[PDB]
Copies of this chain bind each other. A is one copy, B any other.
Amino acid sequence: EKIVVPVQQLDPQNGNKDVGTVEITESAYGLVFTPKLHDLAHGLHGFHIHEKPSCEPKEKDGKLVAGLGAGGHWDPKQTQKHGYPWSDDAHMGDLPALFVMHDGSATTPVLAPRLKKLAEVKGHSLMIHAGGDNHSDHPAPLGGGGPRMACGVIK
């Protein structure tokens, strides 16, 4: 089995852009997230599963915020702490960061060892942030991901 997650670059004002897919598969050691993305900003990006199966924007402080409809990091165990993908004190949605090369493409797979079966992740959203991920809530909350750059619904 695999899940093919369609991913859009988010722009609530001018309209989202299709940027490819991320394929989720089961390895013998956890779920593998294999990007097949194009036309994204180069850099190493925070990459997390968020709670709600939505990539819609939401209003906050008289501004429409991209991706905010996805809610927070997926946290079924209620750690209320952002962390490493191999830490049991981290949100279940915390994945290794996603690398976009200088040409805007992302093709480097990453493992989430705590996630074992595809059924676990259905009904949630897959988010790529503008910033990175130091896998801590310090010095910036949620790894320093910041704005939500691209998103797809996992189902």
A-to-B contact residues, CB < 8 Å = 27-30, 32, 44, 84-88, 96-97, 99, 101, 108-111, 113-114, 135
Bound CA–CA A96/B44 (angstroms) = 14
CB-CB under 8 A from A85, the residues of chain B are 29, 111
Partner of A111, one of B27, B97, B99, B111: B111
How many monomers of this chain does the complex have? Answer: 2
Bound CA–CA A110/B44 (angstroms) = 14
Decide yes or no: A86 and B99 within 8 Å by CB, A29-B30, A30-B29 being known contacts. Answer: no
Bound CA–CA A111/B44 (angstroms) = 17
Partner of A99, one of B28, B29, B44, B87: B44
CB-CB under 8 A from A44, the residues of chain B are 99, 101, 108
Q: Which applies to chain A's interface (DSSP): helix, strand, loop or mixed?
A: loop
Residue ID in chain B nearest A135 by CB atoms:
B109
B30 pairs with A88, CB closer than 8 A:
no
Residue with the greatest number of chain B CB neighbours at <10 A, chosen from A84, A86, A109, A113: A86
B113 pairs with A111, CB closer than 8 A:
yes
Partner of A29, one of B86, B97, B108, B109: B86
Residue ID in chain B nearest A87 by CB atoms:
B27
Q: Report A82 CB to chain B, min CB distance, Å.
A: 15
CB-CB under 8 A from A30, the residues of chain B are 29, 86, 113
B87 pairs with A110, CB closer than 8 A:
no
